[PDB]
mmCIF file of all heavy atoms in Angstrom:
data_model
loop_
_atom_site.group_PDB
_atom_site.id
_atom_site.type_symbol
_atom_site.label_atom_id
_atom_site.label_comp_id
_atom_site.label_asym_id
_atom_site.label_seq_id
_atom_site.Cartn_x
_atom_site.Cartn_y
_atom_site.Cartn_z
ATOM 1 N N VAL A 71 -25.366 163.479 -61.881
ATOM 2 C CA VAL A 71 -25.472 162.057 -61.570
ATOM 3 C C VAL A 71 -26.469 161.817 -60.440
ATOM 4 O O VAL A 71 -26.406 162.436 -59.396
ATOM 5 C CB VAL A 71 -24.099 161.356 -61.323
ATOM 6 C CG1 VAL A 71 -23.145 162.235 -60.565
ATOM 7 C CG2 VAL A 71 -24.296 160.038 -60.593
ATOM 8 N N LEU A 72 -27.435 160.958 -60.731
ATOM 9 C CA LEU A 72 -28.484 160.601 -59.825
ATOM 10 C C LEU A 72 -28.179 159.228 -59.264
ATOM 11 O O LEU A 72 -27.765 158.370 -59.990
ATOM 12 C CB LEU A 72 -29.805 160.534 -60.581
ATOM 13 C CG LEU A 72 -30.973 160.001 -59.775
ATOM 14 C CD1 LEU A 72 -31.325 160.901 -58.641
ATOM 15 C CD2 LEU A 72 -32.189 159.867 -60.660
ATOM 16 N N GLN A 73 -28.308 159.085 -57.968
ATOM 17 C CA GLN A 73 -28.227 157.772 -57.288
ATOM 18 C C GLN A 73 -29.539 157.498 -56.621
ATOM 19 O O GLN A 73 -29.939 158.187 -55.710
ATOM 20 C CB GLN A 73 -27.101 157.737 -56.221
ATOM 21 C CG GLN A 73 -25.793 158.304 -56.758
ATOM 22 C CD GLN A 73 -24.732 157.261 -57.083
ATOM 23 O OE1 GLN A 73 -24.346 157.095 -58.238
ATOM 24 N NE2 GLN A 73 -24.181 156.619 -56.033
ATOM 25 N N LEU A 74 -30.215 156.505 -57.096
ATOM 26 C CA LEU A 74 -31.618 156.298 -56.687
ATOM 27 C C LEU A 74 -31.795 154.915 -56.145
ATOM 28 O O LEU A 74 -31.367 153.944 -56.754
ATOM 29 C CB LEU A 74 -32.512 156.535 -57.938
ATOM 30 C CG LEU A 74 -34.033 156.373 -57.953
ATOM 31 C CD1 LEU A 74 -34.387 154.976 -58.281
ATOM 32 C CD2 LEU A 74 -34.775 156.792 -56.726
ATOM 33 N N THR A 75 -32.437 154.819 -55.006
ATOM 34 C CA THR A 75 -32.937 153.512 -54.520
ATOM 35 C C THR A 75 -34.503 153.549 -54.458
ATOM 36 O O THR A 75 -35.096 154.451 -53.860
ATOM 37 C CB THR A 75 -32.461 153.236 -53.112
ATOM 38 O OG1 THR A 75 -32.920 154.325 -52.305
ATOM 39 C CG2 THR A 75 -30.981 153.224 -53.017
ATOM 40 N N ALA A 76 -35.146 152.535 -55.021
ATOM 41 C CA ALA A 76 -36.612 152.521 -55.154
ATOM 42 C C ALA A 76 -37.182 151.145 -54.851
ATOM 43 O O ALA A 76 -37.023 150.287 -55.645
ATOM 44 C CB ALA A 76 -37.012 152.906 -56.548
ATOM 45 N N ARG A 77 -37.862 150.990 -53.712
ATOM 46 C CA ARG A 77 -38.639 149.757 -53.364
ATOM 47 C C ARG A 77 -40.056 149.654 -53.973
ATOM 48 O O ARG A 77 -40.964 150.257 -53.461
ATOM 49 C CB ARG A 77 -38.792 149.638 -51.847
ATOM 50 C CG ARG A 77 -37.498 149.335 -51.157
ATOM 51 C CD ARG A 77 -37.534 149.557 -49.635
ATOM 52 N NE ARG A 77 -36.274 149.054 -49.077
ATOM 53 C CZ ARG A 77 -36.000 147.758 -48.943
ATOM 54 N NH1 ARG A 77 -36.943 146.838 -49.243
ATOM 55 N NH2 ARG A 77 -34.796 147.376 -48.513
ATOM 56 N N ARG A 78 -40.202 148.813 -54.999
ATOM 57 C CA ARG A 78 -41.481 148.417 -55.687
ATOM 58 C C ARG A 78 -41.422 146.864 -55.854
ATOM 59 O O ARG A 78 -40.313 146.284 -55.844
ATOM 60 C CB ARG A 78 -41.526 149.100 -57.054
ATOM 61 C CG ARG A 78 -41.394 150.589 -57.020
ATOM 62 C CD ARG A 78 -42.258 151.187 -55.947
ATOM 63 N NE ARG A 78 -42.710 152.576 -56.196
ATOM 64 C CZ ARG A 78 -43.144 153.341 -55.221
ATOM 65 N NH1 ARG A 78 -43.125 152.869 -53.966
ATOM 66 N NH2 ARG A 78 -43.581 154.564 -55.470
ATOM 67 N N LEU A 79 -42.499 146.135 -56.060
ATOM 68 C CA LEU A 79 -43.417 146.194 -57.178
ATOM 69 C C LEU A 79 -42.748 145.629 -58.492
ATOM 70 O O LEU A 79 -43.471 145.315 -59.437
ATOM 71 C CB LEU A 79 -44.164 147.597 -57.325
ATOM 72 C CG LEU A 79 -45.397 147.876 -56.433
ATOM 73 C CD1 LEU A 79 -45.897 149.302 -56.443
ATOM 74 C CD2 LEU A 79 -46.587 146.934 -56.828
ATOM 75 N N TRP A 80 -41.410 145.387 -58.498
ATOM 76 C CA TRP A 80 -40.595 145.375 -59.766
ATOM 77 C C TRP A 80 -40.636 144.066 -60.486
ATOM 78 O O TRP A 80 -40.386 143.044 -59.895
ATOM 79 C CB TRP A 80 -39.094 145.665 -59.548
ATOM 80 C CG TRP A 80 -38.744 147.117 -59.155
ATOM 81 C CD1 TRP A 80 -38.207 147.533 -57.961
ATOM 82 C CD2 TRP A 80 -38.891 148.278 -59.955
ATOM 83 N NE1 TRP A 80 -38.030 148.864 -57.972
ATOM 84 C CE2 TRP A 80 -38.454 149.368 -59.178
ATOM 85 C CE3 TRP A 80 -39.360 148.517 -61.250
ATOM 86 C CZ2 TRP A 80 -38.500 150.705 -59.640
ATOM 87 C CZ3 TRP A 80 -39.375 149.865 -61.727
ATOM 88 C CH2 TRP A 80 -38.947 150.923 -60.906
ATOM 89 N N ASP A 81 -40.908 144.129 -61.789
ATOM 90 C CA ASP A 81 -40.638 143.068 -62.675
ATOM 91 C C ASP A 81 -39.972 143.684 -63.884
ATOM 92 O O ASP A 81 -39.786 144.891 -63.931
ATOM 93 C CB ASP A 81 -41.905 142.255 -63.042
ATOM 94 C CG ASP A 81 -43.079 143.123 -63.496
ATOM 95 O OD1 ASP A 81 -42.934 143.970 -64.406
ATOM 96 O OD2 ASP A 81 -44.179 142.953 -62.929
ATOM 97 N N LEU A 82 -39.584 142.830 -64.833
ATOM 98 C CA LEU A 82 -38.695 143.191 -65.880
ATOM 99 C C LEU A 82 -39.290 144.203 -66.836
ATOM 100 O O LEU A 82 -38.612 145.130 -67.222
ATOM 101 C CB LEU A 82 -38.201 141.955 -66.631
ATOM 102 C CG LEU A 82 -37.253 142.299 -67.763
ATOM 103 C CD1 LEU A 82 -36.127 143.219 -67.241
ATOM 104 C CD2 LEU A 82 -36.672 141.039 -68.414
ATOM 105 N N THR A 83 -40.548 144.009 -67.203
ATOM 106 C CA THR A 83 -41.307 144.923 -68.083
ATOM 107 C C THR A 83 -41.250 146.325 -67.564
ATOM 108 O O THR A 83 -40.942 147.249 -68.282
ATOM 109 C CB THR A 83 -42.810 144.480 -68.136
ATOM 110 O OG1 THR A 83 -42.906 143.285 -68.919
ATOM 111 C CG2 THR A 83 -43.695 145.526 -68.778
ATOM 112 N N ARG A 84 -41.579 146.488 -66.298
ATOM 113 C CA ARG A 84 -41.479 147.787 -65.638
ATOM 114 C C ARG A 84 -40.066 148.371 -65.555
ATOM 115 O O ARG A 84 -39.896 149.626 -65.623
ATOM 116 C CB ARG A 84 -42.075 147.704 -64.265
ATOM 117 C CG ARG A 84 -43.604 147.744 -64.284
ATOM 118 C CD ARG A 84 -44.152 147.833 -62.885
ATOM 119 N NE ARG A 84 -44.473 146.521 -62.310
ATOM 120 C CZ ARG A 84 -45.707 146.000 -62.225
ATOM 121 N NH1 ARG A 84 -46.783 146.655 -62.704
ATOM 122 N NH2 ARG A 84 -45.865 144.804 -61.666
ATOM 123 N N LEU A 85 -39.040 147.507 -65.431
ATOM 124 C CA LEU A 85 -37.652 148.033 -65.408
ATOM 125 C C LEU A 85 -37.298 148.578 -66.797
ATOM 126 O O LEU A 85 -36.621 149.619 -66.918
ATOM 127 C CB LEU A 85 -36.636 146.991 -64.927
ATOM 128 C CG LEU A 85 -36.818 146.591 -63.440
ATOM 129 C CD1 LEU A 85 -36.269 145.199 -63.191
ATOM 130 C CD2 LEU A 85 -36.154 147.592 -62.505
ATOM 131 N N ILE A 86 -37.862 147.948 -67.815
ATOM 132 C CA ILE A 86 -37.617 148.357 -69.174
ATOM 133 C C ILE A 86 -38.281 149.714 -69.472
ATOM 134 O O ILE A 86 -37.669 150.591 -70.047
ATOM 135 C CB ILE A 86 -37.988 147.231 -70.175
ATOM 136 C CG1 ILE A 86 -36.949 146.103 -70.053
ATOM 137 C CG2 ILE A 86 -37.953 147.717 -71.618
ATOM 138 C CD1 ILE A 86 -37.211 144.909 -70.936
ATOM 139 N N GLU A 87 -39.495 149.900 -69.020
ATOM 140 C CA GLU A 87 -40.159 151.176 -69.161
ATOM 141 C C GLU A 87 -39.362 152.292 -68.472
ATOM 142 O O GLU A 87 -39.247 153.416 -68.994
ATOM 143 C CB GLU A 87 -41.591 151.112 -68.612
ATOM 144 C CG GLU A 87 -42.547 150.343 -69.515
ATOM 145 C CD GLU A 87 -43.835 149.851 -68.809
ATOM 146 O OE1 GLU A 87 -43.901 149.837 -67.559
ATOM 147 O OE2 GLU A 87 -44.799 149.466 -69.528
ATOM 148 N N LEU A 88 -38.800 151.980 -67.314
ATOM 149 C CA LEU A 88 -37.933 152.918 -66.617
ATOM 150 C C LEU A 88 -36.816 153.298 -67.532
ATOM 151 O O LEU A 88 -36.513 154.422 -67.637
ATOM 152 C CB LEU A 88 -37.409 152.340 -65.305
ATOM 153 C CG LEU A 88 -36.428 153.179 -64.438
ATOM 154 C CD1 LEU A 88 -37.094 154.421 -63.962
ATOM 155 C CD2 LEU A 88 -35.883 152.429 -63.236
ATOM 156 N N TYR A 89 -36.228 152.357 -68.233
ATOM 157 C CA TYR A 89 -35.127 152.670 -69.134
ATOM 158 C C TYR A 89 -35.556 153.520 -70.342
ATOM 159 O O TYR A 89 -34.789 154.380 -70.791
ATOM 160 C CB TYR A 89 -34.410 151.407 -69.620
ATOM 161 C CG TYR A 89 -33.437 150.886 -68.603
ATOM 162 C CD1 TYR A 89 -33.874 150.125 -67.542
ATOM 163 C CD2 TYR A 89 -32.083 151.210 -68.657
ATOM 164 C CE1 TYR A 89 -32.988 149.665 -66.559
ATOM 165 C CE2 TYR A 89 -31.176 150.726 -67.690
ATOM 166 C CZ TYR A 89 -31.633 149.982 -66.631
ATOM 167 O OH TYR A 89 -30.777 149.509 -65.625
ATOM 168 N N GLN A 90 -36.761 153.262 -70.859
ATOM 169 C CA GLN A 90 -37.343 154.059 -71.907
ATOM 170 C C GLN A 90 -37.529 155.483 -71.423
ATOM 171 O O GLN A 90 -37.088 156.399 -72.063
ATOM 172 C CB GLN A 90 -38.673 153.459 -72.371
ATOM 173 C CG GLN A 90 -38.534 152.638 -73.645
ATOM 174 C CD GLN A 90 -39.351 151.344 -73.685
ATOM 175 O OE1 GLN A 90 -40.212 151.065 -72.853
ATOM 176 N NE2 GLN A 90 -39.049 150.540 -74.661
ATOM 177 N N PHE A 91 -38.095 155.636 -70.239
ATOM 178 C CA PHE A 91 -38.284 156.941 -69.653
ATOM 179 C C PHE A 91 -36.990 157.780 -69.387
ATOM 180 O O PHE A 91 -37.005 159.001 -69.462
ATOM 181 C CB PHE A 91 -39.059 156.763 -68.387
ATOM 182 C CG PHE A 91 -39.278 158.026 -67.632
ATOM 183 C CD1 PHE A 91 -40.471 158.745 -67.788
ATOM 184 C CD2 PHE A 91 -38.342 158.473 -66.701
ATOM 185 C CE1 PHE A 91 -40.699 159.909 -67.066
ATOM 186 C CE2 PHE A 91 -38.572 159.621 -65.986
ATOM 187 C CZ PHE A 91 -39.737 160.335 -66.165
ATOM 188 N N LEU A 92 -35.887 157.141 -69.047
ATOM 189 C CA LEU A 92 -34.613 157.882 -68.854
ATOM 190 C C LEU A 92 -33.918 158.012 -70.191
ATOM 191 O O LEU A 92 -32.798 158.445 -70.253
ATOM 192 C CB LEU A 92 -33.700 157.152 -67.870
ATOM 193 C CG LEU A 92 -34.175 156.904 -66.445
ATOM 194 C CD1 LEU A 92 -33.262 155.937 -65.710
ATOM 195 C CD2 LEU A 92 -34.205 158.219 -65.712
ATOM 196 N N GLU A 93 -34.576 157.553 -71.258
ATOM 197 C CA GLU A 93 -34.212 157.920 -72.647
ATOM 198 C C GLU A 93 -32.906 157.300 -73.081
ATOM 199 O O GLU A 93 -32.065 157.970 -73.693
ATOM 200 C CB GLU A 93 -34.181 159.443 -72.863
ATOM 201 C CG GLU A 93 -35.498 160.143 -72.514
ATOM 202 C CD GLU A 93 -35.460 161.657 -72.783
ATOM 203 O OE1 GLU A 93 -34.379 162.159 -73.198
ATOM 204 O OE2 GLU A 93 -36.506 162.351 -72.578
ATOM 205 N N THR A 94 -32.753 156.001 -72.814
ATOM 206 C CA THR A 94 -31.604 155.252 -73.311
ATOM 207 C C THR A 94 -32.059 154.734 -74.650
ATOM 208 O O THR A 94 -33.240 154.633 -74.840
ATOM 209 C CB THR A 94 -31.247 154.070 -72.365
ATOM 210 O OG1 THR A 94 -32.349 153.166 -72.314
ATOM 211 C CG2 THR A 94 -30.937 154.571 -70.941
ATOM 212 N N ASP A 95 -31.122 154.417 -75.560
ATOM 213 C CA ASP A 95 -31.432 153.826 -76.910
ATOM 214 C C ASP A 95 -31.702 152.306 -76.861
ATOM 215 O O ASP A 95 -32.264 151.733 -77.772
ATOM 216 C CB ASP A 95 -30.217 153.951 -77.871
ATOM 217 C CG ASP A 95 -29.823 155.413 -78.218
ATOM 218 O OD1 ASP A 95 -30.681 156.356 -78.093
ATOM 219 O OD2 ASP A 95 -28.631 155.592 -78.668
ATOM 220 N N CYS A 96 -31.154 151.639 -75.867
ATOM 221 C CA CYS A 96 -31.129 150.191 -75.883
ATOM 222 C C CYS A 96 -30.682 149.660 -74.542
ATOM 223 O O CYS A 96 -30.378 150.432 -73.654
ATOM 224 C CB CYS A 96 -30.245 149.673 -77.015
ATOM 225 S SG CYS A 96 -28.568 150.348 -77.073
ATOM 226 N N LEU A 97 -30.720 148.349 -74.360
ATOM 227 C CA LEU A 97 -30.506 147.800 -73.028
ATOM 228 C C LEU A 97 -29.812 146.423 -73.027
ATOM 229 O O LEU A 97 -30.196 145.477 -73.768
ATOM 230 C CB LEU A 97 -31.797 147.839 -72.255
ATOM 231 C CG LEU A 97 -31.817 147.115 -70.890
ATOM 232 C CD1 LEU A 97 -30.997 147.842 -69.798
ATOM 233 C CD2 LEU A 97 -33.228 146.908 -70.486
ATOM 234 N N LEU A 98 -28.720 146.376 -72.248
ATOM 235 C CA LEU A 98 -27.931 145.168 -71.971
ATOM 236 C C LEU A 98 -28.408 144.665 -70.638
ATOM 237 O O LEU A 98 -28.366 145.407 -69.667
ATOM 238 C CB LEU A 98 -26.409 145.499 -71.819
ATOM 239 C CG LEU A 98 -25.326 144.711 -72.565
ATOM 240 C CD1 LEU A 98 -23.988 144.772 -71.854
ATOM 241 C CD2 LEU A 98 -25.715 143.275 -72.858
ATOM 242 N N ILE A 99 -28.888 143.428 -70.562
ATOM 243 C CA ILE A 99 -29.293 142.910 -69.249
ATOM 244 C C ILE A 99 -28.367 141.755 -68.857
ATOM 245 O O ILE A 99 -28.103 140.863 -69.666
ATOM 246 C CB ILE A 99 -30.741 142.417 -69.268
ATOM 247 C CG1 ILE A 99 -31.657 143.520 -69.795
ATOM 248 C CG2 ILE A 99 -31.122 141.923 -67.910
ATOM 249 C CD1 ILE A 99 -33.107 143.136 -69.826
#
């Protein structure tokens, strides 16, 4: 289990790419 805090830059498109990268199938927002 990873607990991560990250200060960016953030908008929704980029949060979604993060989810793609951690290899989830889908996303509830």
Side-chain angles (χ1 to χ4, degrees):
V71 39
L72 173 65
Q73 313 255 116
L74 178 271
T75 57
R77 291 165 173 286
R78 304 315 207 199
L79 279 169
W80 289 115
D81 50 52
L82 180 51
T83 287
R84 282 187 267 259
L85 294 155
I86 289 178
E87 286 161 345
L88 178 63
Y89 280 81
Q90 261 140 10
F91 177 96
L92 300 169
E93 303 182 357
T94 62
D95 296 338
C96 53
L97 172 72
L98 229 205
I99 306 181

